[PDB]
Amino acid sequence: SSPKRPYLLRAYYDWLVDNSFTPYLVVDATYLGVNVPVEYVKDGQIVLNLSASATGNLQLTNDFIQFNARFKGVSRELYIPMGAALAIYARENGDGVMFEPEEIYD
């Protein structure tokens, strides 16, 4: 069967937004195929605010997360392979999920 990660990602994203929390996505910036501003990468990772307010055209698909965001006013198109998505949680209280290390992503 396919990985459960993308389904759980969508579930927690909606739960976070519906509860007025700001969804923060933790990404492994070293993962193959990741496209993010390297200047904002720290400790091999990057945290991204996925709220509709901080993004544009957000897509949460099975194999990837894609959206536009701004950095110091500059707009860029981010692309995150699902295997690089490590967790999603509330900026406000830390509630969310740290994804299980599903084999298929290794």
Binding site: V36, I46, L48, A54, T55, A69, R70, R91
Partner: peptide, 11 residues
């Protein structure tokens, strides 16, 4: 002093 995310709060 709480650190936020990398991208700007508003797109």
């Amino acid at each position: 002093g709480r650190h936020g995310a990398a991208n700007d709060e508003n797109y």
